[PDB]
Recover the amino acids of this structure.
């Protein structure tokens, strides 16, 4: 199924996934499109933090729902 | 209900949904207009195009067409975001 | 004295030049000594006379002095919730 990954840069990313897939596989797909490693990636669904140990079905993430993308921001 | 939980980001979206689901043009578009009231001044990731844009694309009719643009212009009044 | 800059050059933001107080927003980010007056000037930059400033504090010193911006944004607003 398709989902939406909305950034805070006004940019919407679409990924073809399955409802039983883990979050880290989705972050691997984001790395496949972009080259950003998953430790630098954070995903938010309806104000809730996503953990890589669970699946999309565990958070009831379904076809073409909207995610949020915030990046790891460390300085110095 | 948006005045009741004001200046909030923690639980404002959660209180709307227990009275949102009624399948009404008047109850939802007042409750989803109240969602822009709760995050007014937070301007974090609540719905830049998430909830009230999903409200607005329902439109062929009354306040679904109307009561969705008032909340975002209220919540993002302090913004200057062009998108 | 340099701490009455942001609130009293909101006086000077609109009539003279919008960039002029933004060059004074630069003058905020110049006098970086150290945190105390630094904290209080930018308290007002969020929900006291304007917002639209939360893109100018993600510079190369994101530790605490340029991680004030998130605390400027919603954590002191959460302290205004803690009111």
């Amino acid at each position: 199924m398709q989902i939406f990954v909305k950034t805070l840069t006004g940019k919407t990313i679409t990924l073809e996934v399955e409802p039983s897939d883990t979050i880290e596989n989705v972050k691997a797909k984001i790395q496949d499109k972009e080259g950003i490693p998953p430790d630098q990636q954070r995903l938010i669904f309806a104000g809730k933090q996503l953990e890589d140990g669970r699946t999309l079905s565990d958070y009831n993430i379904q076809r073409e729902s909207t995610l949020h993308l915030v990046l790891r921001l460390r300085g110095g | 209900l948006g005045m009741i939980l004001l200046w909030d980001v923690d639980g404002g979206l959660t209180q709307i949904d227990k009275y949102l689901y009624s399948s009404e043009d008047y109850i939802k578009s007042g409750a989803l207009l109240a969602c822009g009231i709760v995050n007014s001044g937070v301007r974090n990731e609540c719905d830049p195009a998430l909830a009230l844009l999903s409200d607005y694309v329902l439109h062929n009719s009354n306040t679904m067409r109307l009561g969705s643009i008032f909340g975002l212009g209220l919540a993002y009044a302090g913004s200057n975001r062009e998108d | 004295l340099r701490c009455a800059l942001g609130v009293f050059r909101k006086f000077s933001r609109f009539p003279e030049a919008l960039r002029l107080a933004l060059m004074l927003n630069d003058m905020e980010l110049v006098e970086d000594i150290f945190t105390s007056c630094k904290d209080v000037v930018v308290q007002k930059q969020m929900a006291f006379m304007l917002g639209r400033h939360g893109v100018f504090l993600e510079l190369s010193e994101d530790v605490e002095e340029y991680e004030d911006l998130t605390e400027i944004m919603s954590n002191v607003q959460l302290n205004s919730n803690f009111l």
The interface with chain A takes residues 58, 60-63, 66-67 of chain C (CB under 8 Å).
